[PDB]
Amino acid sequence: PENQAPKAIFTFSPEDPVTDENVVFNASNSIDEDGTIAYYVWDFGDGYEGTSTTPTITYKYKNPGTYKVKLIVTDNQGASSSFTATIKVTSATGDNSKFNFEDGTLGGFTTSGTNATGVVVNTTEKAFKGERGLKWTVTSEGEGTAELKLDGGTIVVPGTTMTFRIWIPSGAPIAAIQPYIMPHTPDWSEVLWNSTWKGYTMVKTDDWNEITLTLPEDVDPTWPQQMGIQVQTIDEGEFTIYVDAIDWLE
Numbered sequence: 001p002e003n004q005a006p007k008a009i010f011t012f013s014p015e016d017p018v019t020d021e022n023v024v025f026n027a028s029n030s031i032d033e034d035g036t037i038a039y040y041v042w043d044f045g046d047g048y049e050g051t052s053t054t055p056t057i058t059y060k061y062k063n064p065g066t067y068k069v070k071l072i073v074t075d076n077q078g079a080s081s082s083f084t085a086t087i088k089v090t091s092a093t094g095d096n097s098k099f100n101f102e103d104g105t106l107g108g109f110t111t112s113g114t115n116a117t118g119v120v121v122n123t124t125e126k127a128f129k130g131e132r133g134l135k136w137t138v139t140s141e142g143e144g145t146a147e148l149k150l151d152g153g154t155i156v157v158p159g160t161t162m163t164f165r166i167w168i169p170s171g172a173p174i175a176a177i178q179p180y181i182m183p184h185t186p187d188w189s190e191v192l193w194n195s196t197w198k199g200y201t202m203v204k205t206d207d208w209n210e211i212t213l214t215l216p217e218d219v220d221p222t223w224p225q226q227m228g229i230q231v232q233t234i235d236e237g238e239f240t241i242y243v244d245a246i247d248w249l250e
């Protein structure tokens, strides 16, 4: 009459915790079909482990990151099963992004445009993470283009996915917006255009938009790079875009 191993499963809340916030892990749908569960053993993925004879446990992560949480459930006869899930923890305060703007600086960012003029300041009015970000005000005179840009030595290695956060307002005279990275030879004889084109109708207005962009792997790693955000304007008008927490790995 061979013993069946118990079934191990858990969920957690909140789905998106911050550092030092309580997460409740709930293994209550775990079950032994032919006996009872004796205990629940948890590995929180950060160096700490814990056990309970009951299916819930609460836990706090001190540092941001992505943790693998492994649950082992053991029945009254010593048979066990495991279930592993991932939890992402973000910083409760501050902003550790590659471009976080928390030092009050422009981070080397400048503006340019044609049939449009941009100004950029470091602001506390809106931020995606931390207390600060960029506030980019564009005055367009009609059909044109405006850039918020960083020149442009070697910003990222080829293959890198960048994440931009952009607060886009409603009722703006814009057709499209696009984060871009533009590698070029030092003398501009060869230029590569990489961008994530978003139409103005395909955008969350009066809200933060998370847009990713990959620099392709086959780009020459020695080429200087311009990274930025480009807006296409379609009519006269003044509008303000917020930019913060531009981030990538390595």
Ligand SMILES: [Ca+2]
Pocket: 003, 004, 005, 006, 032, 033, 034, 035, 036, 075, 076, 077, 079
């Ligand atoms: Ca059993």
Ligand SMILES: [Ca+2]
Pocket: 095, 100, 101, 102, 127, 128, 129, 130, 131, 132, 133, 244, 245
């Ligand atoms: Ca920030």
